[PDB]
Every structure is written in structure tokens, then in C-alpha cells.
Amino acid sequence: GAMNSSNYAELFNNDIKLFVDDTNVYRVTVHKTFEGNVATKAINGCIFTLNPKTGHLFLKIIHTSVWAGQKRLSQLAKWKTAEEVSALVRSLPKEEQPKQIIVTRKAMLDPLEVHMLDFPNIAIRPTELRLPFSAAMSIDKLSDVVMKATEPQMVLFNIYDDWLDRISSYTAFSRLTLLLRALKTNEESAKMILLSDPTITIKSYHLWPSFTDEQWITIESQMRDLILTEYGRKYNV
Template identity: 40%
Template sequence: MRGGLYYRRTGLVNLCLILRPHQWSMSTPSSLSASVEDQFDYRRTSEKFWIEIQFLWGNYDSEDVSLCISERFTEITSINPSGYGIVIGIDFPYHSYGAYGNWFPGLKTVVDRALKDFMKKSNSRERIRNELHLRGTKSQDLKEIFSDDQITWLVDDTVAYMPTFRSGVAFIVDPRKGELYLKVFKSSAFSCKKSRPGRLATQKTAEEVAQLVRSHPVEDQPKQIIAIREELLEPMKSALVGYSTNIVVNKIKLPELPLQGLLKMKLFGDVFSDSTKPKMVKFSNIYDDWLESISSYEAFSRLGLILRALSKDKNSESVKRILSLEGSVLTPPNCVWPALTLEQWMKVELDLAFHLSASTTASLR
């Protein structure tokens, strides 16, 4: 972290080497945007020149990629100090670029013109930003959700009743720890003819959440419960009346989080399909080991990206192929997701964003 900016390389790198029969005069290292005119030294010449293109993934809402590419240039030249070349960085989500290194006469003009033309024709920025929900700093609401000072639960009753199965599932998630309670409702819960199944499912969800709150010690109870759907607000407040006045029930604007997408993963889908009676199942950490390398907010964002991709993919197989790097990485026992490295997750996240963008574009045709 430097100057509030941190860049991760996705591992998507292109390197080319240019050879010519005559020597180029080279400048000292400088950036593409440097205002000082380059000085070319006849004593610094070469007939070989390399160009490395880095596709970057910016974590923060900034358009400055100079830090990453200058560090990469230093890294390369420390290994091969006699070589001359430049590093070009392109950050697709933030639609920014830069270049740093040695230059020969006329090269800056060519590179600058080519990159401007490329970025002008690229329409990936908004699509990727939309899918990744890259919208600058977190709102105050989101800061509270991931605060260490309080426990927050997200409650989703979107599929608490599914007419096809005459049963359903409600999700209760602690987004800070990745803890999930999955409540399975069976047809017996909707046998009352005086109320519509959908409305009854919402009421049942509220009652189950209230009961779950009561089952926890006071120090482990949520201070805030966020209803994913507006219709759940009043039933949730009513279910908690007389028990606790300290729990705030809210409906805030969150990035799209279709938790029902979890049912397309075998671990959760089997719980639902194999249940013959109502039950509550606890999953201690649906983030697996993510929190060892990223923050809870980043883990929550990654989960949202995966769930959006799963929910928009009819059979989910293409998303599962992306997640497993075409089947090359397996999911360990008792885990939800394939055992990817941090670098592999970066590639997967970018692939999922492109997949979502393509799906959205196709649906609009």
C-alpha cells in the first residue's frame, strides 16, 4: 500500500522483443506522461528492445497506474540491467493506462497514440465496473456492516417459498465472518389456507430469525438485521417485539446479492434437496480461507460476484468451469469453493466479470 493505492497483477502479461540491425539511442527511464523532454544518449544504445504489457486490476478508484509499472520496470532491470525496454500497464476496470521505461526517438508518440486509440475503442470499463460493483469508497452503511464493533445479519427470504417444490430456503448471513444459517422450509409450513404461501414464507422467516437470535448469547447476538427484501421489514420487527429493543432492523441499498445462487453449489443444494423435514443448518464460513488474504469486505464482494454469475447462468456449468480454472483446481472436502491462490482468484474474478458482461449483453439483444 503506497499513497492509498495498491495494484495486483492478474498474471495476464504479454512480452515482446524488438530487434533491429542498427543501434537505438536510449533515454533514461521516464514515464509516458513525463513533462520533461527525454534526452537521448549516444553512449546508451542497443539493437534490442523489449516491451511488456501488464493487464492490471486496481483495488481503489484511481486512474494512476504509474506506481505498479515503475516497480515492475525496476524488477525487470534489476535482473537484466543491460536490457532496455518499457512496461505498459492497462487497467480495464478503471479505464486507465501508463507506461514507464527507456525510450528511443519517436517511441513515446507512437505508444501514446496507440494506447489512446485502444482505450477509446474499448467499452469494457462500465460493464466490468457494474459487475464488480466498483463504485469508490464504501458507504457509511457498508462500513457499519463490516465494523468490528457490531454484528450484522443479512436476511434473505427471496426463495423461502418456491412453488415448483412447494418448499423453500431462507438465508441468514453474517457478512463479516462469512457465517451462514440456511433454513429449509418444507410443504408442511405452508399448509395454512388462510394465508398465501409467499406471505406465509416471509412470516416464517421472520419467526425463525427471531428464534435464532434468542438462541445466541447476548454478546453474539446481532446489533443490526438487514432485510434484503422490503416485504420482510415489518414481519421482522414484529417478530422481535417484546424480546429486544436493541436490535435495529433495516433495509439498506446493497450490491446485488442473489443468495439463492448458493443452491447451485453441491454443498448447499444437497442440504435442500435431501431434506425431508424443516431444519436449520449452520455453515461456519462460506468464505473458506479467503479472510486469510483479503478483507471481509473484499470477500463479500467476491461472493456477490460469484452469486450474480451463478444466478444468471441457467445451468451454472460455465461459471463452475471458470471457478475451477477449467477443472484444473479441485474443491477440498467440506469447502465451498476451489482451492485457488490469490493470483488465481484475481483471474477468476476478471473472467466472471467478463462472463457477466457477455451474459448481460446477450440478454439485451
Template identity: 55%
Template sequence: MLDPLEVHMLDFPNIVLKGSELQLPFQALLKIEKFGDLILRATEPQMVLFNVFDDWLQTVSSYTAFSRLVLILRALHVNNERTRIILRPNPSVITEAHHVWPTLTDEEWIRVEVALKDVILADYGKKNNVNVASLTQTEIRDIILGAEITPPSLQRQQIAEIEKAAKEQSQLTAKTTKTVDKFGNQMLVTTTTNYEQSLYASRTDWRVRALSATHLHLRTRHIYVPTENIDENGLTYVMPKNLLRRLIMIGDLRTQIGGLLFGVSAPENVKIKEIRCIVMPPQVGNHQSVVFSKYAPEHELLRDLEPLGWIHTQPSELGQLSPIDVMTTAKMMATNTEWQGENCIVL
């Protein structure tokens, strides 16, 4: 099939045709009456081009159109008669003269695609003695595309055999370990049972993180603020370096921590906000977010200070606010009336 197309594309050097390992059933196109009649009436070899997408690209994306075409071709390949009935359920459905497939609305195509998928899966389940309900979405996709997959029953059997062989091998293996005690005496220990040979490992590299966290304070030696997209008419915030240094020192490489910013306005200029303290409320953090209580803290030391936003650590730098940061700020402003949007920032 590629040879005539490659010859036809010699005049278009910017187009490269590549083969695919997927077994797409393009031969099912020959089962369509329009193509069959064209072949029967042919008197000489000729190149004929058809748009098998019809006018689908006017309402759906190219990905949806290709998926729909693969569904139709696969269904025609496994059950030609049933597919014809699904594509034209009643005589009122017509096919335009310049089209290949019946003219249906988007809602009708959705119902047709679901029915075609059921036909394909039912044929696969019957041939391989597999319950269709036990198939995963990845297996369903591979079945429709024609990729080679192992039937679930055979796959489970192979997994069970591998696990059994590994278990038998581990039961018969003796392991000798050479260790040294605190007095310098060498000890040879031979173990044959599984629980004596088990190795326990943490899911996280906590040791590397703990050692690296002790050097976080070194990152505060060189702190810079990017000057791009700074509004000269906006507010200016002054952050003491000792506060920022202390926050970074108690932080972690992955788990986020955060605090609420409180400060005052400069006496000579109300547009300059001086951050005086960082309040660390009870919080739950992970590598993606940190969660506070939605109520702002109350303390006698905060009476003369105004809220200026909040600050948190993160594993990597982002070019903009994450959706989680926006939601956290919105919840805090909605719950606490003293939090004003024009004064609060997120660092």
C-alpha cells in the same frame, strides 16, 4: 430470509440485522450441488449454518471476500453453466469437504474474478443492447451489486430531451430588466435572445476573498506558539513580528504563498537562530502547495546570512508536515549544499 435469521439472533441482542436495497442474488446458492443435495435429503425443517467465505479471510480482507462472493453469486444467477466451468476449469481443482467453493490460490482467484465480471457484463450488454466498453466504473459496480441503473442509451436520450426542452423554452422567453443609470433615470430593457440573458460568474468567490484578504493583518494581533512536544535541546528560532505580519498581509485565503528564511546565529548562543529576512522568489501557488525554483537565490545582502528553511501560508492548520512540504524541503537540500537539515525548518 431475514425472518429466520432474526429469530436465530434473539439470543444475541448486540447484533442488529438490517435489510438492503441491493438485489444480491443469494438464491443462487441453491444452484450449488452441496446445498441442493442437502435440501433433497432433508426430512425435517432445520437451521443449518455455512461459512460461504471458506478460508478466504486468512489471506484477504473482508471487503475483498464479500466482493468475491457477490461476483460468484451474480455470475451463477446470470449464467450457471459458464460460471461452473470458470470455478473449476480442470478436474485437478478440488473442493474441501468443509468448504463451499473450490480451493484456489490468490492468483487463480484474481483470474476467476476477472472472468466472472466479464460474464456478468456480457449478459447485461446482451440484454440491454449496450456496448460494455462504454460503461463507467460506477455503472459496472452497480451492475454487479444489482442496483437499479438506467441503460446508458436511454440515459443519454433522456439527457438530450431535457437539454432540447430547456433550449426551446429559453428561445421563447422574453426577459424585461429594470435598471437605473447614473442620472437616476429608470430604463426598461426587454431581451429575447440567449446571449443577452447570459449570466457570467466566476468559478471562485474572488470578491469575498479580496475583501477578506484586507483583514488578514488583524490575525497577527494574537500569535501564539504551541508548547507541546518542544525539545529543550533543539534549536530556538526568533521570528520578528513585522516580517510575519508583512507575509500575512500579502497572502490570500486560499492560494498559498511562501518565502525562504535567512538569518544568523545569536552571538551568545549558537542554538538560537535569528531570522533576519524572508526572500520571496518567483513561485506558483494553489490551494494545496507552492512551488519554488530548486536553486536558492544569490544576492550580496544574503552573503552574511545562512539559510534557515522556508515558510508558507495554507488555508487550514495541519497537525504535521504535508508530503508536499517534505518533498519541497528535500529537493532544496539536495540541490543546495549550504542548506543543512539540522538548521532548516518549515513553517
């Protein structure tokens, strides 16, 4: 059934699974029309489909052309994500196909289930976890590759860079979510923390700086502080 606090650690066994977050699929800017009405302007989006065990991020770019001529676009977005996830599954070798797909929002359940009918043995599951994947567009390299795109397209990255050479996926994923949580809560601050040291650089096939182990513990504590800091400011505590 649903992914929650009880079964956190199933994410790191050897049963292939994918997370799918659809928050960044349909992106808009609101603004005033000349007449003084309100209208929207669509911008490029991205399906976030992540395998938490390996770190592989199957970033499907969603071009603004896909919306052209459509109504109930918030609702179409969910059906378009499902269509694209299904095509990703369909395109993969069978021994690569996920046994579970965990959607981060419950609205995605019926569209994915309908699009996956040809895969009766792949389970579509919700999660009660609050995962911070909407902050994925806060990673400069994803945001850049999405906004530059001139056509639908799929990008590949390791969301863990090379971390799994030194650490396990449980630990990688905790590091990822901490980092994404911070970015969600205070993007400016979080980025400052990541890049203040110009001698630490971001490799070309990577999304995050090449911190050493000790340097990750330092980064890791500064994010924690950042996240606590922002909470008192929000809630006055």
C-alpha cells in the same frame, strides 16, 4: 435507516450484523393438472442469514411440510422467515446477538420487526443494494443439503471458506457477490468457470474450490467477463 452506497463499509466494522434473504424460502414448480388447470408443487427452501464480517452462514432449511394446510403461502413465507430469524437470535448468547439485521427485501421488514419486538435495541434495516443472494441455491453444496432434507433443520458453513485467512471481509464479500452475481446471470457458464479445472478441488467444510491467490484473480476476471457478456446479450449493446 436503509443500507445503500453511502454506508457500504459499515458491513465490515465490528458491530455484529446479519443479512437475511428470504427469496429461497418458498420454492415452487408450476405445472398443468390433469383437468388442464394450473397447480403448484412446493419444494424444500432455505433462509439465507449471513454475517458479512465473519462469513458464517446460518442456513435454515425450510421443509415443504411447513406449508401443508396453509393459504397465502407467499405471505406466510415472510412471517415464517421472521419467526425463524427471531429463534436464531433468541438462541444465541447475548454478546452474540446482532445489533442490526439487514433484510434484502422490504416486505420482510414488518414481519421481522413484529417478531423481534422482544429485541427493541436490534435494528431492522432495509437495503437499497441489489445483492445477489437468491443465487445461493446455485451453490451445489447448499442446493444439495436443502433438497435432501427430510425435516426442518439448520446447516452451518463459512460462505468465505478459509478466505479470511488471506483477505479481509470487505474483499471476501465483494468476491462472494461477484461469484453469486455470475451464478444468477448465467448459472451454467459460471459453474463451468468454477469447476473446469478438475485438479482444483472443493474441501469438505467449504462451498467453493481451493483456488490460489493468482487463481482467484483469474476466476475473478472470468466472472466479470461472464457478467458483461451476458448483459450485451440481454440488452443488445
